């Protein structure tokens, strides 16, 4: 793993600072916001980073797919049998029980991943969780209530919706996760290896361009501690 | 009634909450569903109309006891639009006089 | 109506402006033949 450099960089033009000069704390607040953004952006790469291009195109890959290798890409490179790219005899994707029969609901798909892709001694780890975004989890609980259930089943469906577990594993809300994707791993199995001493933070008052700049080069690496317990599925064609 | 387009009203409330409401406020415990009294009546009506079994009847009574819709408390409000349904924490709504 | 908020605003009109960011800010650039082109994402939009 190469803890390679990420160039986070924010400039505040003098015009924006001046035109909003009435709000005394204006400047400070944007700093707070950008700090929050940066942290969020961090984890965003960790799941959308497909590669590290020498130049970042904010228009071609607004998901930051070319800034580093997120944990998901590490799976797609090292141990690509963990990455269930396609389902059983589907067409370049994983269909669900809507199209005939393949993994039925999402519960069976995560169950199969847990007992066929995660290593045996981790498949029964109590700490194993399932990272998912907003579309798949919400749309997984959706057919609990969209089926016109009876009152007992409606009480049960409300309870199941309360319990965020996918299949039998606790689920984790994660922004900017690649939709139609699912990760099964331990949160202790994921790590940021940043180079100590790689904080090239600097605050430049670039009058030559009339902007308050701020550079943070950060050497980081999205690394999975062990691939024994890091499985995933791609293209979960969740039919509706 | 026809096909499967948000099924019963609770499915619609769930989709509205988890696709339109901000993903981080989607689970604020005070997120209440504001809808007219008549709408709640018409959605809880099938629980007692379709001739369900007695144990399903006691379950239905339990649900009707819970004003909760979708999975969210429902606020019965007068003069609300027919065939409409708002969802928001009741501290979003301000009157600036 | 006991749950609605009542604020005594001393002006008919007015706005509240939300101070967001226009998305991702962190990227990477090889400075061998390039600059670390810094971009502003800070956006703000207001309700009236």
């Amino acid at each position: 793993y190469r803890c390679e450099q990420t160039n986070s960089d924010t400039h505040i033009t003098y015009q924006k600072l001046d035109a909003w000069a009435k709000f005394a704390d204006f400047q400070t607040r944007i700093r707070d916001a950008i700090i929050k953004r940066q942290a969020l952006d961090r984890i965003m790469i960790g799941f959308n980073g497909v590669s590290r291009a020498a130049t970042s195109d904010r228009v071609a890959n607004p998901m930051l797919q070319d800034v580093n290798k997120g944990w998901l890409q590490n799976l797609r490179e090292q141990a690509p049998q963990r990455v269930m790219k396609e389902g059983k005899a589907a067409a370049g994707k994983i269909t669900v029980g809507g199209a005939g029969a393949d993994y039925g609901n999402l519960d069976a798909l995560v169950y199969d991943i847990t007992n066929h892709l995660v290593e045996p001694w981790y498949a029964e780890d109590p700490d194993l969780v399932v990272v998912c975004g907003r579309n798949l989890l919400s749309d997984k609980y959706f057919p609990l209530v969209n089926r016109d259930r009876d009152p007992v089943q409606q009480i049960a469906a409300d309870l199941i919706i309360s319990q965020k577990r996918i299949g039998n594993l606790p689920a984790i809300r994660v922004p900017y996760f690649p939709a139609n994707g699912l990760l099964v791993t331990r949160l202790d199995n994921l790590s940021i290896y940043y180079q100590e001493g790689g904080r090239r933070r600097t605050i430049l008052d670039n009058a030559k361009r009339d902007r308050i700049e701020n550079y943070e080069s950060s050497n980081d690496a999205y690394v999975i501690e062990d691939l024994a317990c890091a499985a995933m599925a791609e293209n979960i064609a969740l039919a509706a | 009634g026809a096909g499967a387009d948000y099924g019963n009203l609770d499915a619609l409330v769930y989709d509205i909450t988890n696709h339109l409401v901000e993903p981080w406020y989607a689970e604020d415990p005070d997120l209440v569903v504001v809808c007219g009294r008549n709408l709640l009546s018409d959605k809880y009506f099938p629980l007692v109309n379709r001739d369900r079994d007695p144990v399903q009847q006691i379950a239905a009574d339990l649900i009707i006891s819970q004003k909760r819709i979708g999975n969210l408390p429902a606020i019965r409000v007068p003069y609300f639009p027919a065939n409409g349904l708002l969802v928001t924490r009741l501290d979003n709504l301000s009157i600036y006089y | 109506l006991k749950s609605i908020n009542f604020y005594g605003v001393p002006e008919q009109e007015g706005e509240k402006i939300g101070l967001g960011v226009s998305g991702p800010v962190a990227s990477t650039t090889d400075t061998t033949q390039q600059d670390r082109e810094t971009s502003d994402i800070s956006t703000m939009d207001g309700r009236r």
Binding site: R29, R37, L40, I43, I172 | - | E11, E13, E15, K16, M44
Partner: peptide, 19 residues
């Protein structure tokens, strides 16, 4: 001409990142 539009400043809260 027309009254000044008084303005406050709300910080638009980002997605929570406790992950």
């Amino acid at each position: 001409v027309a009254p000044s539009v008084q303005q406050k400043l709300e910080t638009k809260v980002q997605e929570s990142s406790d992950f």
